[PDB]
Amino acid sequence: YTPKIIVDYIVKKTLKNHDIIKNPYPRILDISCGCGNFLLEVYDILYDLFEENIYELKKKYDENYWTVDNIHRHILNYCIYGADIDEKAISILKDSLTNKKVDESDIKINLFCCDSLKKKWRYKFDYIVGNPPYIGHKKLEKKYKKFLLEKYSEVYKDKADLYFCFYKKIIDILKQGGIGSVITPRYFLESLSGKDLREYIKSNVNVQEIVDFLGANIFKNIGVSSCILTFDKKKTKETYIDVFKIKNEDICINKFETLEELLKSSKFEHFNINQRLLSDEWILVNKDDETFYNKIQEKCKYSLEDIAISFQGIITGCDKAFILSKDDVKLNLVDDKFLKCWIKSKNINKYIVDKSEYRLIYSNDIDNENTNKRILDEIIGLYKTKLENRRECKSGIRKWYELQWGREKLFFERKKIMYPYKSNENRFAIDYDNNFSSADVYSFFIKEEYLDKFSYEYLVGILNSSVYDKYFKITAKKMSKNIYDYYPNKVMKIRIFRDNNYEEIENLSKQIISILLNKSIDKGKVEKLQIKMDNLIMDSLGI
DNA sequence: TGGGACTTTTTGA
DNA sequence: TTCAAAAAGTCCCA
Numbered sequence A: 001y002t003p004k005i006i007v008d009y010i011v012k013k014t015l016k017n018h019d020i021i022k023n024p025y026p027r028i029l030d031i032s033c034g035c036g037n038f039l040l041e042v043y044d045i046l047y048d049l050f051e052e053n054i055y056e057l058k059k060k061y062d063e064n065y066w067t068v069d070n071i072h073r074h075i076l077n078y079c080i081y082g083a084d085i086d087e088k089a090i091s092i093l094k095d096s097l098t099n100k101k102v103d104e105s106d107i108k109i110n111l112f113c114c115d116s117l118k119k120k121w122r123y124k125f126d127y128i129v130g131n132p133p134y135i136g137h138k139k140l141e142k143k144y145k146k147f148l149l150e151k152y153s154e155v156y157k158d159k160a161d162l163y164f165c166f167y168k169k170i171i172d173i174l175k176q177g178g179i180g181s182v183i184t185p186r187y188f189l190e191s192l193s194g195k196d197l198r199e200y201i202k203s204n205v206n207v208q209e210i211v212d213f214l215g216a217n218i219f220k221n222i223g224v225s226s227c228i229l230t231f232d233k234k235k236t237k238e239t240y241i242d243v244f245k246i247k248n249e250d251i252c253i254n255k256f257e258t259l260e261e262l263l264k265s266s267k268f269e270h271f272n273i274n275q276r277l278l279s280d281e282w283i284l285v286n287k288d289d290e291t292f293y294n295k296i297q298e299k300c301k302y303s304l305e306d307i308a309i310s311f312q313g314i315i316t317g318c319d320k321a322f323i324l325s326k327d328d329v330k331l332n333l334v335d336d337k338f339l340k341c342w343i344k345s346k347n348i349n350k351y352i353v354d355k356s357e358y359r360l361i362y363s364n365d366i367d368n369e370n371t372n373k374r375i376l377d378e379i380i381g382l383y384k385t386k387l388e389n390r391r392e393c394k395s396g397i398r399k400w401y402e403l404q405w406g407r408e409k410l411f412f413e414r415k416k417i418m419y420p421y422k423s424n425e426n427r428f429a430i431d432y433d434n435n436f437s438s439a440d441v442y443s444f445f446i447k448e449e450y451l452d453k454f455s456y457e458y459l460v461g462i463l464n465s466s467v468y469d470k471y472f473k474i475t476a477k478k479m480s481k482n483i484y485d486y487y488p489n490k491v492m493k494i495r496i497f498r499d500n501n502y503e504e505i506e507n508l509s510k511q512i513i514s515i516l517l518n519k520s521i522d523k524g525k526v527e528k529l530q531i532k533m534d535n536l537i538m539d540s541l542g543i
Numbered sequence B: 001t002g003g004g005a006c007t008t009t010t011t012g013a
Numbered sequence C: 001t002t003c004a005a006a007a008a009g010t011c012c013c014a
């Protein structure tokens, strides 16, 4: 059930400027209505609009058809259309709409109990509103997913979600110059799975307004990040998009009378984006952030992908069989040649990695089971059956006791930079102990030919600065509240510079690292040093 | 007596 | 063969 304030805002967005005199026959459709939250409000708005202009309609059009008593009949016969796959919800909505008037003559209501995706829609609609489903995400039957792939290949592919198709349908059954307004998950704005959907939306309909609630819990006790999309197929020319991005993600929806108050308050920021300039990722930032990003982009000759090699950590496939506490007695049963240091995302802070508390048994270096039978029977064998169910173990590529994805040792066993894949701030650390990591920590090392131009200390100095924190967070994907995804497809696109301030920045980074490494630890001066470094970086970027 | 925050491994390519 | 993206369940505090 969509919150009432959201429904009211969507309906008002769709209908507030409709010319009832010019077209007293608007078709307003809810593809997925359920209990009918949108359609009841649409009925109330339409009744008020008709009763407001009833005498003008009577003068212009037929004088006998346009009477106050006949408004209910007209609305239910020509104006309101709803669809659903639940018969009980359809019957409830039908009963509610019938009771909206309170049997002399036959009354017809345009309600459909069918699959909106597989329905042959007879005619298009002036206004389309509502809330596509999200409860069924990956529970679609194999035949249904095949149908979606075959019939919705332009928006649905593999990991695409169901509601994507709804968008396409809503665009297709929309009358020329009509208006659509939906509330959906916001994930398609930034997820790679929705690139086709975003291109389909951009090239067909003019988007008017995007309300981005980010991680704010719009739906009570439901963990979905929602956004409201409004669009039209009118003959516009410039097609600028209003964007209302939330600022405080901890606000309460119920603490406002109307959504206009919330949007116009300090809890939201507004900015305009030229639709013709939209990229594939749909980067939505204000003027100041855009200028900041542009200055940093034009000031930096190199990028991390240009000067570094990135890789994902070890994926054992069963961590319980290969990861042990470094004080475990079973580590006396494993030759120290096969033991590597193991760290977690919690072990990585700025500029340094904590001492590894865990050891990884690099079982890929074990040749035969006869020599090392003790390890394979008393430590790793405890999960053999589960180890036997891995895909490569079943296919014969990988032996049962080996790591499923052991990567390359020489990648990990070198001076490199490691960072967690999900964090609230930039945390890039220089690894000195040849640490191995799971997939929750990504790593990269500087290319051989760029070692003379860039040093690891300088890289972690600039990358951990507040300037680069803002620079990354501008275009980073926000997967949850106060959490950013740090994946190579975004991290390796970070652009880096080098100028006359390089040596001082490197020296400050070395000072911070040395302070962080010693015994008598108090952060203190580090912060001060950081501040100076940031000044230099801003001096380098003219910001 | 409810109520959401995090990490391992599955899988398309 | 192997990479890397992204999917996927359990549990504790006021």
Ligand SMILES: Cc1cc(Nc2cc(C[NH+](C)C)cc(NC(=O)c3cccc(Nc4ccnc5ccccc45)c3)c2)nc(N)n1
Pocket (backbone or CB within 6 Å): B005, B006, B007, C008, C009, C010, C011, C012
């Ligand atoms: C806050 C809180 C809490 C709790 N608990 C717990 C917690 C944890 C962590 N940390 C501490 C927080 C954990 C637990 N378990 C289990 O099993 C585990 C382990 C590991 C890992 C994992 N992951 C996963 C899985 C699957 N899927 C998914 C999906 C998404 C994401 C993720 C995920 C899980 C429990 N409780 C309450 N009450 N609260």
Ligand SMILES: OC[C@H]1O[C@@H](n2cnc3c(NCCCc4ccccc4)ncnc32)[C@H](O)[C@@H]1O
Pocket (backbone or CB within 6 Å): A031, A032, A033, A034, A035, A083, A084, A085, A086, A089, A114, A115, A116, A117, A131, A132, A133, A134, A136, A140, A141, A144
């Ligand atoms: O907010 C969601 C509301 O909307 C209805 N609804 C869902 N999905 C369709 C829908 N088509 C897609 C069908 C997908 C599917 C496939 C296999 C098994 C189950 C579902 N058509 C009309 N109403 C719908 C729900 O019943 C509910 O009232």
